[PDB]
Coordinates of C-alpha atoms and ligand atoms in Angstrom, one line a residue:
Chain F
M749 CA 5.6 -2.5 -42.9
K750 CA 5.2 -2.6 -46.6
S751 CA 6.9 0.7 -46.9
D752 CA 10.3 -0.1 -45.4
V753 CA 10.3 -3.4 -47.3
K754 CA 8.2 -2.7 -50.3
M755 CA 11.1 -1.2 -52.4
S756 CA 13.1 -4.4 -51.4
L757 CA 10.2 -6.7 -52.2
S758 CA 9.0 -5.8 -55.8
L759 CA 5.3 -5.4 -54.8
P760 CA 3.0 -3.8 -57.3
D761 CA 1.2 -0.5 -56.6
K762 CA -1.7 -0.3 -54.1
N763 CA -4.8 1.9 -53.9
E764 CA -7.1 2.3 -50.8
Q765 CA -10.1 4.2 -52.1
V766 CA -13.1 4.7 -49.8
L767 CA -16.4 5.1 -51.7
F768 CA -19.2 6.9 -50.0
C769 CA -22.3 5.2 -51.4
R770 CA -25.7 6.8 -51.3
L771 CA -28.8 5.3 -49.7
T772 CA -31.6 4.6 -52.1
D773 CA -35.0 6.3 -51.6
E774 CA -36.5 3.1 -50.1
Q775 CA -33.4 2.3 -48.1
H776 CA -33.4 5.9 -46.9
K777 CA -37.1 5.5 -46.0
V778 CA -36.5 2.4 -43.9
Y779 CA -33.5 4.0 -42.2
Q780 CA -35.5 7.2 -41.5
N781 CA -38.4 5.3 -40.1
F782 CA -36.1 3.3 -37.9
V783 CA -34.2 6.2 -36.4
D784 CA -37.6 7.8 -35.8
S785 CA -38.9 4.6 -34.3
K786 CA -39.6 4.4 -30.6
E787 CA -37.0 1.6 -30.1
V788 CA -34.2 4.1 -30.9
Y789 CA -35.8 6.5 -28.4
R790 CA -35.7 3.7 -25.7
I791 CA -32.0 3.1 -26.6
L792 CA -31.1 6.8 -26.3
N793 CA -32.8 6.9 -22.8
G794 CA -30.7 3.9 -21.5
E795 CA -33.9 1.7 -21.3
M796 CA -32.8 -0.8 -24.0
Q797 CA -29.5 -2.1 -25.2
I798 CA -27.7 -0.2 -27.9
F799 CA -26.7 -3.4 -29.7
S800 CA -30.2 -4.1 -31.1
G801 CA -30.4 -0.7 -32.8
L802 CA -26.8 -0.8 -34.0
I803 CA -27.4 -4.1 -35.7
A804 CA -30.7 -3.0 -37.2
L805 CA -29.0 0.1 -38.7
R806 CA -26.1 -2.0 -40.0
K807 CA -28.6 -4.3 -41.7
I808 CA -30.4 -1.3 -43.2
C809 CA -27.2 0.1 -44.8
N810 CA -26.2 -3.4 -45.9
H811 CA -29.6 -4.1 -47.5
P812 CA -33.2 -3.6 -46.4
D813 CA -33.6 -7.2 -45.4
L814 CA -35.6 -6.0 -42.4
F815 CA -38.6 -5.5 -44.5
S816 CA -38.3 -7.8 -47.6
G817 CA -40.0 -5.9 -50.3
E831 CA -41.2 -10.2 -60.1
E832 CA -37.7 -8.8 -59.8
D833 CA -38.7 -7.9 -56.2
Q834 CA -37.4 -11.1 -54.5
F835 CA -35.4 -11.0 -51.3
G836 CA -32.2 -9.0 -51.5
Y837 CA -32.7 -7.5 -54.9
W838 CA -29.5 -5.5 -55.7
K839 CA -31.2 -2.3 -57.0
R840 CA -32.8 -1.6 -53.5
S841 CA -29.4 -0.9 -51.9
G842 CA -26.9 1.8 -52.9
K843 CA -23.9 -0.3 -52.0
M844 CA -25.1 -3.1 -54.3
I845 CA -25.6 -0.5 -57.1
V846 CA -22.0 0.5 -56.7
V847 CA -20.9 -3.1 -56.5
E848 CA -22.8 -4.0 -59.6
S849 CA -21.2 -1.1 -61.5
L850 CA -17.7 -2.1 -60.2
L851 CA -18.1 -5.7 -61.1
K852 CA -19.3 -4.8 -64.6
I853 CA -16.3 -2.6 -65.2
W854 CA -13.8 -5.0 -63.7
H855 CA -15.2 -8.0 -65.5
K856 CA -14.8 -6.2 -68.8
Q857 CA -11.3 -5.3 -67.7
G858 CA -10.6 -9.0 -67.3
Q859 CA -9.8 -8.8 -63.6
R860 CA -10.5 -10.9 -60.5
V861 CA -12.3 -9.4 -57.5
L862 CA -12.3 -10.2 -53.7
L863 CA -15.7 -9.3 -52.3
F864 CA -15.8 -9.1 -48.5
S865 CA -18.8 -8.8 -46.1
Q866 CA -19.1 -8.8 -42.3
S867 CA -22.4 -10.6 -42.5
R868 CA -23.3 -14.1 -43.6
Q869 CA -26.8 -13.0 -44.6
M870 CA -25.4 -10.2 -46.7
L871 CA -23.0 -12.6 -48.2
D872 CA -26.0 -14.8 -49.2
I873 CA -27.7 -11.8 -50.7
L874 CA -24.5 -11.0 -52.7
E875 CA -24.3 -14.6 -53.9
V876 CA -27.9 -14.5 -55.1
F877 CA -27.1 -11.2 -56.8
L878 CA -24.0 -12.6 -58.5
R879 CA -25.9 -15.6 -59.8
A880 CA -28.5 -13.2 -61.0
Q881 CA -25.6 -12.0 -63.1
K882 CA -23.7 -14.6 -65.1
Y883 CA -20.5 -14.1 -63.0
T884 CA -18.8 -17.2 -61.7
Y885 CA -18.0 -16.9 -58.0
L886 CA -16.8 -18.9 -55.1
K887 CA -17.9 -18.5 -51.5
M888 CA -16.2 -19.2 -48.1
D889 CA -17.9 -18.2 -44.9
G890 CA -17.8 -19.9 -41.5
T891 CA -20.3 -22.6 -42.6
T892 CA -18.1 -24.0 -45.4
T893 CA -16.3 -27.0 -44.0
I894 CA -12.8 -26.3 -42.9
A895 CA -11.4 -29.3 -44.8
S896 CA -12.5 -27.6 -48.1
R897 CA -11.3 -24.1 -47.3
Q898 CA -7.7 -24.4 -48.4
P899 CA -8.7 -26.3 -51.6
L900 CA -11.1 -23.4 -52.3
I901 CA -8.4 -20.8 -51.9
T902 CA -6.1 -22.9 -54.0
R903 CA -8.8 -23.2 -56.7
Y904 CA -9.3 -19.5 -56.7
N905 CA -5.6 -18.8 -56.9
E906 CA -5.0 -21.3 -59.7
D907 CA -7.6 -21.0 -62.4
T908 CA -8.7 -17.5 -63.4
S909 CA -12.2 -18.5 -64.8
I910 CA -13.5 -17.8 -61.3
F911 CA -14.1 -14.1 -61.1
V912 CA -15.2 -13.1 -57.6
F913 CA -14.5 -14.8 -54.3
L914 CA -17.2 -14.2 -51.7
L915 CA -15.7 -14.0 -48.2
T916 CA -16.7 -13.2 -44.7
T917 CA -13.9 -11.0 -43.3
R918 CA -13.5 -13.3 -40.2
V919 CA -12.7 -16.5 -42.1
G920 CA -11.7 -14.9 -45.4
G921 CA -9.3 -12.5 -43.8
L922 CA -6.8 -13.7 -41.2
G923 CA -3.8 -15.2 -42.8
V924 CA -5.1 -16.7 -46.1
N925 CA -3.3 -16.0 -49.3
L926 CA -5.5 -14.9 -52.2
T927 CA -3.1 -13.2 -54.5
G928 CA -5.1 -14.6 -57.5
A929 CA -7.5 -11.9 -56.5
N930 CA -6.7 -8.5 -57.9
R931 CA -9.6 -6.3 -56.8
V932 CA -10.9 -6.3 -53.2
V933 CA -14.0 -4.5 -52.1
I934 CA -15.0 -4.4 -48.4
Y935 CA -18.8 -4.3 -48.7
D936 CA -19.5 -3.3 -45.1
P937 CA -17.3 -1.8 -42.3
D938 CA -16.6 -3.4 -39.0
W939 CA -16.3 -1.8 -35.6
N940 CA -12.9 -3.4 -35.3
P941 CA -10.5 -1.7 -37.8
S942 CA -8.2 -4.7 -38.1
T943 CA -10.9 -7.0 -39.4
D944 CA -11.0 -4.8 -42.5
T945 CA -7.2 -4.2 -42.5
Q946 CA -6.5 -7.9 -42.7
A947 CA -9.4 -8.4 -45.2
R948 CA -7.8 -5.8 -47.5
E949 CA -4.3 -7.2 -47.0
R950 CA -5.6 -10.6 -48.2
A951 CA -4.6 -9.5 -51.8
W952 CA -1.5 -7.2 -51.7
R953 CA 0.9 -9.9 -50.5
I954 CA 4.2 -11.5 -51.5
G955 CA 3.1 -13.2 -54.7
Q956 CA 0.8 -10.5 -56.1
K957 CA 1.9 -9.8 -59.7
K958 CA -0.8 -7.2 -60.5
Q959 CA -1.7 -3.8 -59.2
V960 CA -4.2 -4.0 -56.3
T961 CA -6.9 -1.5 -55.4
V962 CA -9.1 -1.8 -52.3
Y963 CA -12.6 -0.2 -52.3
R964 CA -14.3 0.4 -48.9
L965 CA -18.0 1.0 -49.3
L966 CA -19.7 3.3 -46.8
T967 CA -23.2 4.6 -46.9
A968 CA -22.8 8.3 -46.6
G969 CA -24.3 9.9 -43.5
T970 CA -25.3 6.6 -42.0
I971 CA -24.1 4.3 -39.2
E972 CA -21.4 3.1 -41.5
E973 CA -19.7 6.5 -41.6
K974 CA -19.8 6.5 -37.8
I975 CA -18.3 3.0 -37.6
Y976 CA -15.6 4.3 -40.0
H977 CA -15.0 7.2 -37.7
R978 CA -14.7 4.9 -34.7
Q979 CA -12.2 2.7 -36.4
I980 CA -10.2 5.7 -37.6
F981 CA -10.0 6.8 -34.0
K982 CA -9.0 3.3 -33.0
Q983 CA -6.4 3.2 -35.8
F984 CA -5.0 6.5 -34.6
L985 CA -4.8 5.2 -31.0
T986 CA -2.9 2.1 -32.5
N987 CA -0.5 4.2 -34.6
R988 CA 0.3 6.3 -31.6
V989 CA 2.1 3.3 -30.1
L990 CA 3.1 1.2 -33.1
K991 CA 4.6 3.8 -35.6
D992 CA 5.0 7.1 -33.8
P993 CA 3.9 8.8 -30.5
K994 CA 3.3 12.2 -32.3
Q995 CA -0.1 11.2 -33.7
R996 CA -2.5 14.0 -34.9
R997 CA -5.5 14.1 -32.5
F998 CA -8.7 12.6 -34.0
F999 CA -10.8 15.7 -34.5
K1000 CA -13.4 14.6 -37.0
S1001 CA -15.9 14.0 -34.3
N1002 CA -16.5 13.5 -30.5
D1003 CA -17.6 9.8 -31.0
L1004 CA -20.8 10.0 -29.0
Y1005 CA -24.2 8.2 -28.8
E1006 CA -25.8 10.2 -31.6
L1007 CA -24.9 7.6 -34.2
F1008 CA -28.7 6.9 -34.6
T1009 CA -29.2 10.0 -36.8
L1010 CA -29.6 9.9 -40.6
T1011 CA -27.8 12.8 -42.3
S1012 CA -27.8 11.9 -46.0
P1013 CA -25.5 14.4 -47.8
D1014 CA -26.3 17.0 -50.5
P1386 CA 27.4 2.2 -19.5
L1387 CA 25.4 5.4 -19.8
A1388 CA 27.5 8.2 -18.2
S1389 CA 24.8 9.7 -16.0
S1390 CA 24.3 12.6 -18.5
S1391 CA 22.5 11.0 -21.4
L1392 CA 20.6 9.3 -18.7
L1393 CA 19.9 12.5 -16.7
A1394 CA 19.2 14.5 -19.9
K1395 CA 16.6 11.8 -20.9
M1396 CA 15.1 12.2 -17.4
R1397 CA 14.8 16.0 -17.7
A1398 CA 13.3 15.5 -21.1
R1399 CA 10.7 13.0 -20.0
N1400 CA 9.7 15.1 -16.9
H1401 CA 9.6 18.4 -18.6
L1402 CA 6.9 17.1 -21.0
Chain L
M1 CA 55.9 -7.2 7.5
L2 CA 59.7 -6.9 6.7
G3 CA 59.6 -10.5 5.5
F4 CA 56.7 -9.5 3.2
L5 CA 58.6 -6.4 2.0
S6 CA 61.7 -8.4 1.3
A7 CA 59.7 -11.1 -0.5
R8 CA 58.0 -8.5 -2.7
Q9 CA 61.2 -6.6 -3.5
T10 CA 63.1 -9.8 -4.5
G11 CA 60.3 -11.3 -6.5
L12 CA 59.8 -14.5 -4.4
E13 CA 56.1 -13.6 -3.8
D14 CA 53.7 -11.9 -6.2
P15 CA 52.9 -8.4 -5.0
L16 CA 49.3 -9.5 -4.7
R17 CA 50.5 -11.6 -1.7
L18 CA 51.6 -8.5 0.2
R19 CA 48.5 -6.5 -0.8
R20 CA 46.1 -9.2 0.3
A21 CA 47.9 -10.3 3.5
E22 CA 48.3 -6.7 4.5
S23 CA 44.7 -5.9 3.7
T24 CA 43.7 -8.8 5.9
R25 CA 46.0 -7.6 8.7
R26 CA 44.3 -4.2 8.4
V27 CA 40.8 -5.7 8.6
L28 CA 41.7 -7.8 11.7
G29 CA 43.1 -4.6 13.3
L30 CA 39.9 -2.6 12.5
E31 CA 39.0 -0.5 15.5
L32 CA 36.9 2.6 16.4
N33 CA 38.9 5.5 15.1
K34 CA 38.5 8.4 17.5
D35 CA 41.2 9.9 15.1
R36 CA 38.4 10.3 12.5
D37 CA 34.9 11.6 13.0
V38 CA 31.8 12.0 10.7
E39 CA 29.9 15.2 11.0
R40 CA 26.5 14.7 12.7
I41 CA 23.8 16.0 10.4
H42 CA 21.0 13.4 10.8
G43 CA 18.4 14.1 13.4
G44 CA 17.3 10.5 13.1
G45 CA 18.9 7.1 12.8
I46 CA 21.0 6.4 9.8
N47 CA 19.4 3.5 7.9
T48 CA 21.7 3.3 4.9
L49 CA 25.2 4.3 3.8
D50 CA 26.7 4.0 0.3
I51 CA 30.3 4.9 -0.6
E52 CA 30.6 5.6 -4.3
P53 CA 32.1 2.7 -6.3
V54 CA 34.4 4.9 -8.4
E55 CA 37.2 6.7 -6.5
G56 CA 35.5 5.8 -3.1
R57 CA 35.7 9.4 -2.0
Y58 CA 32.1 10.3 -1.2
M59 CA 29.5 8.7 1.0
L60 CA 25.7 8.9 1.0
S61 CA 23.6 8.6 4.1
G62 CA 19.9 8.2 4.5
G63 CA 18.3 9.1 7.8
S64 CA 15.1 8.2 9.6
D65 CA 14.3 11.9 9.5
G66 CA 14.1 11.8 5.7
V67 CA 17.3 13.8 5.1
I68 CA 20.0 12.6 2.7
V69 CA 23.6 13.6 3.6
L70 CA 26.5 13.5 1.1
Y71 CA 29.9 13.3 3.0
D72 CA 33.5 13.7 1.8
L73 CA 35.6 10.9 3.2
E74 CA 39.0 12.4 2.1
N75 CA 41.2 14.0 4.7
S76 CA 41.7 17.3 2.8
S77 CA 43.2 18.9 6.0
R78 CA 46.9 18.5 6.8
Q79 CA 46.1 17.3 10.3
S80 CA 46.1 13.7 11.3
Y81 CA 42.7 14.3 12.8
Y82 CA 39.8 15.2 10.6
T83 CA 36.0 15.1 10.4
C84 CA 34.4 13.8 7.3
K85 CA 32.6 17.0 6.4
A86 CA 29.1 17.0 4.8
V87 CA 29.5 18.3 1.3
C88 CA 25.7 18.3 0.4
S89 CA 22.4 17.6 2.1
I90 CA 18.9 17.0 0.9
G91 CA 17.5 18.7 4.0
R92 CA 14.2 19.6 5.6
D93 CA 14.0 22.7 3.4
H94 CA 14.9 21.0 0.2
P95 CA 11.7 20.9 -2.0
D96 CA 12.4 17.3 -2.9
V97 CA 13.2 16.1 0.6
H98 CA 11.8 12.7 1.5
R99 CA 8.7 13.0 3.7
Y100 CA 9.5 9.9 5.8
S101 CA 12.5 7.6 6.5
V102 CA 15.0 7.1 3.7
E103 CA 15.4 3.3 3.7
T104 CA 18.1 3.1 1.0
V105 CA 20.5 5.3 -0.9
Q106 CA 22.8 4.2 -3.7
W107 CA 25.3 5.8 -6.0
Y108 CA 24.8 5.2 -9.6
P109 CA 27.5 2.7 -10.5
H110 CA 29.9 3.8 -13.3
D111 CA 29.6 7.5 -12.5
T112 CA 29.3 9.8 -9.5
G113 CA 27.0 12.4 -11.1
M114 CA 23.7 10.6 -10.3
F115 CA 22.4 8.7 -7.2
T116 CA 19.1 7.2 -6.3
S117 CA 17.3 6.9 -3.0
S118 CA 14.1 5.2 -1.9
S119 CA 11.9 6.1 1.1
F120 CA 8.9 5.1 3.1
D121 CA 7.1 7.9 1.4
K122 CA 6.6 5.3 -1.4
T123 CA 9.0 7.0 -3.8
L124 CA 12.3 6.1 -5.4
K125 CA 13.8 9.5 -6.4
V126 CA 16.7 9.8 -8.9
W127 CA 19.0 12.7 -8.0
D128 CA 21.5 14.6 -10.1
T129 CA 24.5 15.0 -7.7
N130 CA 25.8 18.2 -9.2
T131 CA 22.6 20.2 -9.3
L132 CA 21.1 18.2 -6.4
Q133 CA 17.7 18.3 -8.0
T134 CA 15.5 15.3 -8.7
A135 CA 15.7 14.0 -12.2
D136 CA 12.9 11.4 -11.8
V137 CA 10.5 10.0 -9.3
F138 CA 9.1 6.5 -9.3
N139 CA 5.9 6.5 -7.2
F140 CA 4.9 3.1 -5.7
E141 CA 1.6 2.1 -4.1
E142 CA 3.5 0.7 -1.1
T143 CA 6.4 1.8 1.0
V144 CA 9.9 0.9 -0.3
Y145 CA 12.1 -1.3 1.9
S146 CA 15.1 -1.5 -0.4
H147 CA 16.2 -0.7 -3.9
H148 CA 19.3 -1.7 -5.8
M149 CA 21.0 -0.8 -9.1
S150 CA 23.1 -3.5 -10.7
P151 CA 26.8 -2.7 -9.9
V152 CA 27.7 -4.2 -13.3
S153 CA 25.1 -3.4 -15.9
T154 CA 26.9 -1.7 -18.7
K155 CA 23.7 -2.6 -20.8
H156 CA 20.6 -2.1 -18.7
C157 CA 19.8 0.5 -16.0
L158 CA 17.1 -1.3 -14.0
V159 CA 16.5 -0.6 -10.4
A160 CA 15.1 -3.5 -8.4
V161 CA 12.7 -2.1 -5.8
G162 CA 11.3 -4.1 -2.9
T163 CA 8.3 -2.7 -1.1
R164 CA 5.7 -4.2 1.3
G165 CA 4.0 -5.6 -1.8
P166 CA 4.7 -9.2 -2.7
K167 CA 6.0 -8.2 -6.1
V168 CA 9.5 -6.9 -7.0
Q169 CA 9.3 -3.7 -9.1
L170 CA 11.9 -3.2 -11.8
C171 CA 12.2 0.5 -12.8
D172 CA 14.1 1.3 -16.1
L173 CA 15.9 4.6 -15.7
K174 CA 16.4 4.6 -19.4
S175 CA 12.9 5.5 -20.7
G176 CA 11.0 5.4 -17.5
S177 CA 9.3 2.0 -17.3
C178 CA 8.1 1.0 -13.8
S179 CA 5.7 -1.7 -15.1
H180 CA 7.9 -4.8 -15.0
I181 CA 7.2 -6.9 -11.9
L182 CA 8.7 -10.1 -10.6
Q183 CA 5.9 -12.1 -9.0
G184 CA 6.3 -15.2 -6.9
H185 CA 7.0 -13.9 -3.4
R186 CA 4.1 -13.8 -0.8
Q187 CA 5.1 -11.1 1.6
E188 CA 7.1 -7.9 1.9
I189 CA 10.4 -8.0 0.0
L190 CA 12.9 -6.9 2.6
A191 CA 16.0 -7.0 0.5
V192 CA 17.0 -6.9 -3.2
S193 CA 20.5 -7.2 -4.7
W194 CA 21.7 -7.7 -8.2
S195 CA 24.4 -10.2 -8.8
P196 CA 27.8 -8.5 -9.2
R197 CA 28.8 -11.1 -11.7
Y198 CA 25.7 -11.6 -14.0
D199 CA 24.1 -8.5 -15.5
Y200 CA 20.5 -9.8 -15.1
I201 CA 20.6 -12.0 -12.0
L202 CA 18.6 -10.5 -9.1
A203 CA 18.4 -12.0 -5.6
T204 CA 15.3 -11.0 -3.6
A205 CA 14.6 -11.8 0.0
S206 CA 11.1 -11.5 1.6
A207 CA 9.5 -11.7 5.0
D208 CA 7.9 -15.1 4.0
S209 CA 11.3 -16.7 4.7
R210 CA 12.2 -17.2 1.1
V211 CA 15.0 -15.9 -1.1
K212 CA 14.6 -16.2 -4.8
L213 CA 17.1 -15.7 -7.7
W214 CA 15.7 -14.3 -10.8
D215 CA 16.9 -13.7 -14.4
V216 CA 15.0 -10.5 -15.2
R217 CA 15.4 -11.2 -18.9
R218 CA 13.6 -14.5 -18.5
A219 CA 9.9 -14.9 -19.0
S220 CA 9.4 -17.9 -16.8
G221 CA 9.7 -17.0 -13.1
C222 CA 12.5 -17.3 -10.5
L223 CA 15.6 -19.4 -11.3
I224 CA 16.1 -20.7 -7.8
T225 CA 14.5 -20.8 -4.4
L226 CA 17.0 -21.2 -1.6
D227 CA 16.4 -24.1 0.7
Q228 CA 18.0 -24.6 4.1
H229 CA 18.4 -28.3 3.9
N230 CA 18.9 -28.8 0.1
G231 CA 16.4 -31.7 -0.1
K232 CA 16.4 -33.4 3.2
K233 CA 13.0 -31.9 3.9
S234 CA 11.5 -31.9 0.3
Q235 CA 7.9 -31.0 -0.5
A236 CA 5.9 -30.0 -3.5
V237 CA 6.8 -26.4 -3.5
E238 CA 3.9 -24.4 -2.1
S239 CA 5.3 -23.4 1.3
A240 CA 8.7 -25.2 1.7
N241 CA 12.1 -24.1 0.4
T242 CA 12.6 -21.3 2.9
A243 CA 16.1 -19.8 3.3
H244 CA 15.4 -19.0 7.0
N245 CA 13.0 -19.7 9.8
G246 CA 11.8 -16.1 10.0
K247 CA 12.0 -13.0 7.8
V248 CA 15.0 -12.7 5.5
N249 CA 15.9 -9.0 5.8
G250 CA 19.4 -9.0 4.5
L251 CA 21.1 -10.0 1.2
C252 CA 24.7 -9.6 0.2
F253 CA 26.7 -11.2 -2.6
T254 CA 30.3 -12.0 -1.8
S255 CA 32.8 -10.0 -3.7
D256 CA 33.2 -12.4 -6.6
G257 CA 29.5 -13.0 -6.8
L258 CA 29.7 -16.8 -6.6
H259 CA 28.1 -16.9 -3.2
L260 CA 25.1 -15.2 -1.5
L261 CA 24.9 -14.3 2.2
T262 CA 21.4 -14.1 3.7
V263 CA 20.5 -12.9 7.2
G264 CA 17.1 -13.6 8.7
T265 CA 15.2 -13.0 11.9
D266 CA 15.8 -16.6 12.9
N267 CA 19.1 -15.1 14.2
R268 CA 21.0 -16.8 11.5
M269 CA 23.2 -16.0 8.5
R270 CA 23.6 -18.5 5.8
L271 CA 25.9 -18.9 2.8
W272 CA 24.5 -20.1 -0.5
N273 CA 26.0 -21.1 -3.8
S274 CA 24.7 -18.3 -6.0
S275 CA 24.7 -20.6 -9.1
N276 CA 22.4 -23.4 -7.8
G277 CA 21.3 -21.8 -4.5
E278 CA 22.6 -24.7 -2.5
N279 CA 23.4 -24.1 1.1
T280 CA 27.1 -24.4 1.8
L281 CA 26.4 -25.3 5.5
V282 CA 28.7 -22.6 6.8
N283 CA 27.8 -22.2 10.4
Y284 CA 28.5 -18.6 11.3
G285 CA 27.1 -19.2 14.8
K286 CA 24.2 -17.0 16.0
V287 CA 23.7 -13.6 14.3
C288 CA 21.4 -11.5 16.5
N289 CA 19.1 -9.5 14.2
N290 CA 15.5 -8.6 15.0
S291 CA 15.2 -5.8 12.4
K292 CA 11.8 -5.3 11.0
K293 CA 13.2 -3.6 7.9
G294 CA 16.0 -4.4 5.4
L295 CA 19.3 -5.0 7.1
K296 CA 22.2 -3.7 5.1
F297 CA 25.5 -5.6 5.6
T298 CA 28.6 -5.7 3.4
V299 CA 31.5 -7.9 2.6
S300 CA 35.2 -7.2 2.3
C301 CA 37.1 -7.1 -1.0
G302 CA 40.7 -7.8 -2.0
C303 CA 41.9 -9.4 1.2
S304 CA 43.6 -12.8 1.6
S305 CA 40.4 -14.0 3.3
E306 CA 37.0 -12.5 2.6
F307 CA 35.0 -11.0 5.5
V308 CA 31.4 -10.2 6.2
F309 CA 30.5 -7.2 8.4
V310 CA 27.0 -7.9 9.8
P311 CA 25.1 -5.5 12.2
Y312 CA 24.9 -7.5 15.5
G313 CA 22.7 -5.4 17.7
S314 CA 24.7 -2.4 18.8
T315 CA 28.0 -3.9 17.5
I316 CA 29.3 -4.9 14.0
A317 CA 30.2 -8.6 14.0
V318 CA 33.1 -9.5 11.6
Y319 CA 33.1 -13.1 10.4
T320 CA 35.1 -15.0 7.8
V321 CA 32.8 -15.7 4.9
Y322 CA 34.1 -19.2 4.0
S323 CA 34.8 -20.6 7.5
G324 CA 32.3 -18.9 9.8
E325 CA 34.9 -18.0 12.4
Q326 CA 33.7 -14.7 14.0
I327 CA 36.8 -12.5 13.7
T328 CA 35.5 -10.0 16.3
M329 CA 32.7 -7.7 17.3
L330 CA 33.3 -4.0 16.9
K331 CA 31.5 -2.2 19.8
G332 CA 31.3 1.5 19.6
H333 CA 27.6 2.4 19.0
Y334 CA 25.0 3.1 21.6
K335 CA 21.9 1.7 19.9
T336 CA 21.2 -1.0 17.3
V337 CA 23.4 -0.8 14.2
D338 CA 21.4 -0.5 11.0
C339 CA 24.0 -0.4 8.2
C340 CA 27.7 -0.9 7.5
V341 CA 29.6 -0.1 4.3
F342 CA 33.1 -1.1 3.5
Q343 CA 35.7 1.3 1.9
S344 CA 37.7 -1.2 -0.1
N345 CA 40.7 1.1 -0.8
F346 CA 41.9 1.3 2.8
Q347 CA 39.9 -1.5 4.6
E348 CA 37.8 1.1 6.4
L349 CA 34.3 0.5 7.7
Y350 CA 31.6 3.0 8.3
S351 CA 28.6 2.0 10.3
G352 CA 25.4 4.0 10.9
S353 CA 23.0 3.3 13.8
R354 CA 19.7 4.5 15.3
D355 CA 21.8 6.7 17.7
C356 CA 22.2 9.2 14.9
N357 CA 25.9 8.5 14.5
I358 CA 28.2 7.2 11.8
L359 CA 31.3 5.6 13.2
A360 CA 34.5 5.1 11.2
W361 CA 36.4 1.9 12.0
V362 CA 40.0 2.1 10.6
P363 CA 42.9 -0.4 11.1
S364 CA 45.0 0.3 14.1
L365 CA 48.6 1.3 13.1
Ligands
MG1 MG1 0.2 -15.9 -41.7

């Protein structure tokens, strides 16, 4: 890990903040009308597949691209709370003269964030699964070499997973994934051997939405993983029962036979 | 004998000469000792015997009635006649007693304080000798024919377990791990034996007529599959390369671990090069076995010539390992002989049988 080695590796400090964004009134209205919709009722009765509703809710927390509402074009940043947070963060970090790594599970949301960044004057760079593979390592090299490029738009699946992006300094995971490790690797894209600046990771969750539940699922999965990678004495995940009521909107506010036998009595007494 | 004593005393011959020639003479003179008896405690046939490797004082015995007996083989009485008294017993009233036949019992090598025993109740139980309570139980989905701990492993403490399943279970006594399986056999594994020479070499014999040598460290299957003919009948290996023409229900490495003895229900015993599994073509004649379970047979140690003591029906046939010449057949049992075990300090043999007896064979004079 980068705690038994970090002192021996001269890595800069690391932060892992988790921001609990707030749904906007219109985003909240869409989410409330979808949880109250009949389709969710069919899901909860076992009539229809849970996946459809889960994906719809994830889209709603990402941005209301379900119902596309001038300055009212598709994917306008002010309609989503997470994009309000991202706009504020990019503003502060740009004036702090820093380079950001903006991740997203979804290609559609990445397109929305690209249109948003170009609505700003920020210079960006994008790499999702559609960008030709032959150009991906040049892109990474470009981002790492010249610092005029400010943000790097990445899908967590292609932009995570082994690529070195130490030219980035800030990384925000725009949307959680059911799989914890997708986001672990996405955040570890920055704080690597070669990072000369302090890194802080921001994870954006819409408070009281499906995203907080996905966060709970992946905390539970991470605890199950830590039980068998770092120690077997893990604290039980108690924050929830992790049930199928994640369709509810709850907006806040030689051993000598004696060491051997002793080990056996230990194991069996448990 | 006086020539040997004079040659030892005067330095002409190395003392090893007298030791080995005399041990051989004692083995050839092996005979049913009515001057020694073993206390009858088993209500059923004795399937397995195991003399402890260190000090060779105590013997384990597993019966068909599920009892385990722990005998003292030292003549603590001043008489020339003595009965090997039963020190302990996992009896019908012991809460950990095996519910069915004990098919194997083995002392922990390197120490007398723990011993392990496997049964047809689908358990391999680890016992602490002193408290005589189970320290561990390895439950299996299928009844155990034979288990074996490496006589040599100062590093690992794996138990190779062969059941009616086609896979060989490796159970780590150090933190209890019964997940490792050696797959590649196709029928019940009737015998398993770790190499006495190599820490991680395991020989496994199965009812599908095949004997395989494994390197349990290795991640790429069995090292060798023993073949009767060594290539005369060669086929793309899907069914050929059988050690025997029936079930192979007995395995025994020679003392030095450079050769492997297999006995199968083709009424044959074969001698194989344990490094490349090549048949040495030692004849051995006909070895009558029709045992439907693992057949425990032993070799001699520290003699001028090595011997193999194989159960031959109701007798114990003694053969020279490296020439095949049957030394003799020790006949003192009343039913089929299941197991024999060799006390290497005094060239004594103990053999159990289905007639609920354990007979000592000691050299005459
Ligand atoms: Mg890599």
